[PDB]
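Quick one, tokens below:
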């Protein structure tokens, strides 16, 4: 059987509807998003900053465009500026400042097609942002998801400002991650297709250039849910929240079947993120709509925001 560890989890904060997108900025501040917040049945998602000591929450942004509320669901911190890139299920891709101001990156992609709602994203070390888009067209267009139909797409927002659809026909693409060589070269993209219990891989040949698509890993279980958020640890092991399984799966560098499983004190882990330079992993979950933390066996893989702009001196 696959080895299972049961680390001690510590509650961080609660009352976060749809708790998702955990992320640390360049100053070490912690943020999470609340995509499930609604006001009178209408989307009113929030981006919050969490005090690690008290667990107190501060709403920094409640995105809305032309009267349509956003559904912020995933985040990545930029490197050269302390700003957050946020995947929004209703607005697409947003760039949010610590002061709460935000900008919608694109209404349409590089081919002029209306943008699809986004769920999560991952920066590669070259500054390109790989994004999952499981939702239908962004507001004002009517909402819809790809849990059944295969119209979920993947985008790559390049450093040159191009929003390129790099693949599509996915059944609710969710988590996403980029594997790098030790010299910093991005070479593999991993995409979670939630309901199908599959993790897909592609070889990265350059900015917005992916090929050799294949099924890379298998997510355990027949439960409703599947792979949600993911991140690499420093040894390139891929940790994946398996929503509905009560576990976070751990895949070795070669994928396939998980090499280890991490038991959680809740059934629906949605996402995770390492605290910089530590073995501490923060986990968002939908059973209690809260955030927790636990200690992993090693530090996490550095996020783009922690990398050296000029290389190793
Ligand atoms: Ca997600
Ligand atoms: Ca993460």
């Amino acid at each position: 059987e696959i080895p299972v560890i049961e680390p001690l989890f510590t509650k961080v904060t609660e009352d976060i509807p749809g708790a998702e997108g955990p992320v640390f900025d360049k100053n070490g501040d912690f943020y999470i998003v609340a995509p499930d917040v609604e006001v009178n049945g209408k989307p009113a998602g929030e981006i919050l900053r969490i005090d690690l000591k008290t667990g107190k929450k501060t709403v920094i942004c409640k995105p809305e465009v032309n009267g349509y509320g956003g559904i912020p669901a995933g985040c990545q911190c930029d490197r050269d500026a302390n700003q957050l890139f946020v995947a929004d299920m209703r607005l697409g891709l947003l760039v949010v400042q610590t002061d709460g101001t935000f900008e919608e990156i694109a209404k349409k992609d590089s081919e002029g097609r209306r943008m699809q709602g986004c769920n999560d994203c991952a920066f590669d070390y070259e500054g390109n942002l790989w994004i999952t888009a499981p939702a239908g067209e962004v507001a004002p267009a009517d909402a819809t998801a790809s849990m059944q139909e295969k119209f979920g797409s993947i985008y790559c927002f390049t450093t040159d400002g191009q929003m390129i659809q790099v693949d599509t026909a996915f059944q609710f693409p969710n988590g996403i991650a980029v594997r790098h060589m030790n010299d910093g070269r991005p070479y593999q993209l991993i995409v979670a297709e939630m309901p199908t219990k599959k993790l897909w891989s592609y070889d990265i040949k350059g900015p917005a250039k992916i090929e050799n698509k294949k099924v890379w890993g298998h997510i355990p279980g027949t439960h409703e849910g599947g792979a949600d958020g993911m991140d690499f640890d420093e040894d390139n092991n891929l940790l994946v929240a398996n929503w509905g399984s009560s576990h976070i799966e751990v895949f070795g560098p070669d994928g396939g079947q998980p090499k280890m499983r991490i038991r959680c004190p809740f059934e629906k882990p949605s996402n995770l993120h390492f605290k910089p330079q530590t073995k501490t992993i923060f986990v968002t979950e939908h059973e209690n709509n809260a955030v927790w933390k636990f200690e992993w066996q090693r530090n996490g893989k550095k996020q783009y925001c922690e990398t050296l702009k000029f290389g190793i001196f």
